[PDB]
Design a protein around this nucleic acid. Structure first.
Lengths: 70, 615
RNA sequence: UACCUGGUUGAUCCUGCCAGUAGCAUAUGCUUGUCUCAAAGAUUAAGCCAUGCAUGUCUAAGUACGCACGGCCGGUACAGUGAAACUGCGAAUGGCUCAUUAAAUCAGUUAUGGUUCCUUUGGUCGCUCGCACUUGGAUAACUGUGGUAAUUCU
RNA sequence: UGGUGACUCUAGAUAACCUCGGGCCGAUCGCACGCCGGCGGCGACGACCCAUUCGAACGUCUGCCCUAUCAACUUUCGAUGGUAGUCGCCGUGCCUACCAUGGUGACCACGGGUGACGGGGAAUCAGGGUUCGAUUCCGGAGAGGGAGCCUGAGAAACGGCUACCACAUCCAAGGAAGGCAGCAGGCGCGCAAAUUACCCACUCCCGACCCGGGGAGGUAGUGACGAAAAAUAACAAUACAGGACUCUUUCGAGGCCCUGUAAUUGGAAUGAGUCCACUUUAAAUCCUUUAACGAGGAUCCAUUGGAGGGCAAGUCUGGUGCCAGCAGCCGCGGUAAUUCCAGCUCCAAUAGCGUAUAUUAAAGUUGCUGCAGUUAAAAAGCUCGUAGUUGGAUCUCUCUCGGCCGAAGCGUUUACUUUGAAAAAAUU
RNA sequence: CAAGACGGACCAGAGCGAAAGCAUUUGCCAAGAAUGUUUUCAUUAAUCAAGAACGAAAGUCGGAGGUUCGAAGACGAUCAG
RNA sequence: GAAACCAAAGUCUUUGGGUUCCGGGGGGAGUAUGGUUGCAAAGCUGAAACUUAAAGGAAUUGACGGAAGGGCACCACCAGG
């Protein structure tokens, strides 16, 4: 759920084994997926992807470089 | 929406609404009606002496409280209209930092100018991130202890050393009293992080604690926990938990005069007998040998990572006896398993919820949307406790603080907690499945024997016999029931009482219905191959062994799936059908599943940790 | 450098869009040794503001009776420097933001023969046929008595 | 008298008026002092007015984005004009009184919207164009919202005042005080943006002023917004591996041949750093200049994306096995996975490189240059018809006033072209 | 005998009309293209936002008449359904 | 010209005779809403949210016919042994 208007949005967690980093009710930085409003690839009707969790990037957590606070 | 005035006026309405929400939030702390603002100070690096910054920060009207070891004081200023309570902690001593950093309102970290922080402070900060940050505020000390030439580059080097742990923060320095004025101004106005695990119960910090022994020989008496209520409206009927000494019943609340008002004896409640929460945790009606064992654990983990659960069938013990309570499954995901099929006497000793989510919603709405007749927040109250050991007061004289929080309904009973948890990369010691590990599960501290499982979405969860360094597991154990969310920490005695951190996470839903399945795969080398037919040896050793495990379907490391047709030899020689033809370098294997349950090893007492150090 | 490539079919030739390609701008990730330039709370909220500062001012040349000073030489009206106060000038320039605003603002073009103008610069300053070898009354500065919880109040 | 292209101009004459809330005609200071009791040089302040400069203020002609699911708008309460006035610094419906019934519109009036302050300009781009411009220069507007004022040459001023509205600070509860869309800083909002530093030395401005003041401005701090240069190694000998050349049937052997690879050997040369001294500067810092220490790669070690096609670089090895996942698109995974995940090797850019969004070129897929309409998306069912757009051929310089020339008309009027002078600097 | 209907075969790769459309004889009505002209007017023209006539069948309002055919609606056959 | 085909669908990268209407991947959808005409049914004008990598146009073969013919063989048949 976005902060700025309150809308409900489905977002795709990018890499393998990264959904466990996302915990219930956390701050997530969400981007577009890359087709400018058009649903991308396999996922139907889901056009956004999570970039950061709790102000730590998922790329660092997946690569095991940084640690996720709470 | 049209009509530019209409869009503008709708935006102004929304602006008013969010400003009213923010203003309604920020008056809850540090004011005439608000309780004092508790600031906990940690000097991370070993070179920093906290008395130096502590006397730079103490000047405002001071009230120097004292303890056995730690020295915390009260600050009051009408200049900023702010009430402060500064409390100091030492890194490495994870007991004090952990049990009083979960009630502090803002944490101030001190950093040396030359290095980032100490390794012991690194351990402390890792644990503090893993259990929850109230509000961190970076600070340094030795910046003006150097000339300007190295000063600016020292700030550059510190900024380099911080971004790996704290993603981005300004480093606010402490050298003068005016700089302390800047810091106090900063800590007065911060974006306060609502740590909801504090807010959902009624937690209270103790400034005074008096023991009135009913009988001194019985070593138990009446306790006087007086301090500030910081959570919700605290009610007497709800039981009271002390973080290091368990949950128990409280008998009386009085409200005396506050010690430090911002602008300078009567009892509130006694507990009724019928409306009291009952203390019923269970149902009423019923040297080199250690190194060798560690190397054996290393070999077992190395065997149970390149091969999942390969167990060699013993040729001495009969196979259908040693796996008597195992069953076969065609497919792990789809084959049904009855959750109420085989239960021991241990699950006849816990408490089950018909619907956890409905109960959690009901309890949370009864806390939030309803008001109780207890004492409100910010009040300086006193609690008389009927039953308490003596030694806690002795601990109150040692240097550790006392924190008491009033629980939700149905939080004292025993249930089966499931903890989502992943391994900290700092430790690499192999931990077996049924080891005894210390859980810090959100104001609670206890040894337990958990069971590790996968964190998937399905019903059955395969038991993990070791802790994986990247996979996020579920630790399942009998434990006192706690309502999620909850920070969860895992420690182990390394040597001489040094609590080492292994893994951390959150508390998932609590239920005994989450079954854990232990698997055993039995290997066999196929020594004869026909087309879609195979004769395999060394899987069993008797003749009736194949007849007992007939309906279990064989699988194959190369992906073939089959089912056995006949036994041929008196020994373990076994005819098997297949979908296709096996390769010559292939092995067949059969899956056996049983239901496994956690051991009942729970005890609320925890030994005091020694200061942590690096090997 | 006036450029294209994959994707409908059993295969072809098309229409056709989707995707790739390069830029440029904001955000962000990961990494970062030297060195010279250099943008930077515009976007969302022309939302709210703790505290400090941002607008003052004297020459030989308006007014010195503050011993406030070293200091004349002594009845020497006023030696000098000069706090304060009156007086004169500035504070309408600058800075900031882009909310308003669609022939409005603004841009090139013309006009004031339809007007206002501190200052600066040059002109004009006994053209006037009707006590002056010096006019009057106050009021700050200072002395002294105060009020109010409080102000650059009096 | 003098002058404009044109006066109801300037100047002159006469009759008068000249406000008690009034118009000018020095009751001022300094500097040196001096000549036949009296006359005086230089400067400062002042002043009715004129002219000037700095402007301000109104007008003129032309030029704005999207919208018809905005086609009639305006005029009782001025809408368009006329006469007289009122106010105004003036010209005017600017306001009032009396008349007239006008004014604008398919050449899009009026109404809306705008994620609109306009321009100089920015990015792209063959040519045409498309998009942007909050933003340091110019012009405008506003200091929380509206309104009304004081003083002054200049303000409907807000680092001035008075009110109401909305917030909000100190109380002794009687009252008092506000305005960071100035500089730093905070909250809040957020995907999104720095120091509560130092100085008037530079640039200029203000004042009574060779002196004082200046968060204008300068200077450092944060700063991978973006931009320019540019290290992370060079040479030689060996030791192998190949490639050619010669001699050898070949295998093999040589070269004052070539090309690679070497935690191989040798020396030299250096900068990043730590540190002096100088210089820099308002005082510093930085850059630049010197002494001192400072380099063998097994580090003073380069990253970020990728290896199925598009699209450069592996049908290499192990793990997971249509699971997990990858993949912009096409697609892969169901066991020899060329695509997942690792290792090794390799590719691309390189102190930089990924992703997301907006916009541009590709897009001759918005078509003016320059698209399409039988069958792919598309021609109104048909004809009349107004505005609009478009439209056959045709026609080759002088008379008066002044010194061969200057003045005066030109010629039906325009479009078009060419020249000329005016057109802010920065940017280009 | 009466009632309303429709005008086959002739009927064509023909004809006319702006298209929709138009087929029994006779008269009247006012049109209409092409052809022929050493006629007349002399640019009056092409296409058209606005606006306007016509517009098969079916349908909808008022009347008349209802032969045939016939939406709806009523029968009978046909079957594991 | 993509070709089927077309003396126009030609005189089109060697691109400019005048003018009108109209299309911009496929669905949602000629749908909702609004206006207007209509007794009514309806007509004219007419979106978006969301959704997909195709939808489509011409021509060329035939895997296969549950399409039909022939033709072959004492490892098939007739006459037989």
């Amino acid at each position: 759920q976005l902060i700025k208007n309150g809308k409900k949005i489905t977002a795709f967690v990018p890499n393998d084994g990264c959904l466990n980093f996302i915990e219930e009710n956390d701050e997530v930085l969400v981007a577009g997926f890359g087709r400018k409003g058009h649903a991308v690839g396999d996922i139907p009707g889901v056009r956004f992807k999570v970039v950061k969790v709790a102000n730590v990037s998922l790329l660092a957590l997946y690569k095991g470089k940084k640690e996720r606070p709470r | 929406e049209l009509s530019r005035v209409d869009q503008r006026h709708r935006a102004s309405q929304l602006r008013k609404q969010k400003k009213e929400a923010v203003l309604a939030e920020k008056r809850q702390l540090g004011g005439k009606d608000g309780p004092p603002h508790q600031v906990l100070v940690v000097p991370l690096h070993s070179r920093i002496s906290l008395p130096e910054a502590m006397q730079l920060l103490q000047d405002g009207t001071v009230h120097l409280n004292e303890l056995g070891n730690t020295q915390n004081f009260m600050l009051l200023c009408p200049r900023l209209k702010h009430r402060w309570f500064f409390t100091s902690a030492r890194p490495g001593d994870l007991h004090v930092v952990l049990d009083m950093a979960k009630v502090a309102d803002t944490i101030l970290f001190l950093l040396d100018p030359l290095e980032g922080w100490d390794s012991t402070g690194d351990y402390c900060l890792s644990c503090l991130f893993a259990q929850g940050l109230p509000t961190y505020t970076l600070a340094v000390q030795g910046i003006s202890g150097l000339p300007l030439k190295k000063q600016i580059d020292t700030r550059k080097k510190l900024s380099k050393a911080v971004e790996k742990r704290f993603p981005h923060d300004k480093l606010l320095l402490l050298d003068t009293q005016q700089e302390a004025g800047m810091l106090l101004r900063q800590l007065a106005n911060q974006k306060q992080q609502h740590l909801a695990f504090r807010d959902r119960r009624a937690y209270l910090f103790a400034h005074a604690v008096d023991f009135v022994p009913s009988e001194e020989n019985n070593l138990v008496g009446t306790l006087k926990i007086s301090g500030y209520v910081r959570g919700q409206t605290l009610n007497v009927n709800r039981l009271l938990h002390i973080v290091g000494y368990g949950d128990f019943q409280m008998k009386q609340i009085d409200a005396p005069g506050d010690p430090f008002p911002l602008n300078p004896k009567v009892l509130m409640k006694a507990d009724p007998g019928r409306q009291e929460s009952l203390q019923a945790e269970v149902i009423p009606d019923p040297d080199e040998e250690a190194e060798a064992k560690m190397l054996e654990k290393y070999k077992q983990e190395r065997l149970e990572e390149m091969f999942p659960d390969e167990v060699d069938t013993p040729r001495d013990v009969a196979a259908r006896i040693r796996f008597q309570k195992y069953r076969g499954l065609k497919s792990f995901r789809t084959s049904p398993w009855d959750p109420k099929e085989n239960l021991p006497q241990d699950y006849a000793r816990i408490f089950q919820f018909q619907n956890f989510t409905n109960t959690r919603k009901s309890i949370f709405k009864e806390v939030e949307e309803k008001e109780v007749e207890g004492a409100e927040v910010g009040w300086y109250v006193t609690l008389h406790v009927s039953e308490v050991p003596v030694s806690v007061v002795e601990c109150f004289r040692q240097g550790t603080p006392l924190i008491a929080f009033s629980l939700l309904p149905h939080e004292q009973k025993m249930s089966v907690l499931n903890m989502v948890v992943r391994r900290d990369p700092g430790n690499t010691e192999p931990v077996k499945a049924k080891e005894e590990l210390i859980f810090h599960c959100g104001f609670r501290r206890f040894r337990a024997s958990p069971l590790f499982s996968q964190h998937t979405a399905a019903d059955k969860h395969k038991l993990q016999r070791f802790l994986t360094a990247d996979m996020a597991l579920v630790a399942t154990v009998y434990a006192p029931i706690t309502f999620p969310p909850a920070s969860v920490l895992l420690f182990k005695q390394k040597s001489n009482g040094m609590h080492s951190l292994i893994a951390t996470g959150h508390l998932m839903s609590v239920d005994p219905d989450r079954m854990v399945i232990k698997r055993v795969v039995l290997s066999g080398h196929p020594f004869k191959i026909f087309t879609k037919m195979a004769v395999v040896r060394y899987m069993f050793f008797n003749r009736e062994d194949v007849l007992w495990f007939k309906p279990v379907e064989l699988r194959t490391k190369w992906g073939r799936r089959g089912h056995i047709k006949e036994p041929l030899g008196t020994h373990g020689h076994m005819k098997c059908s297949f979908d296709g033809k096996l390769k010559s370098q292939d092995t067949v294997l059969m899956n056996l599943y049983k239901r496994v349950f956690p051991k009942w090893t729970y005890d609320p007492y925890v030994p005091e940790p020694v200061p942590w150090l690096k090997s």
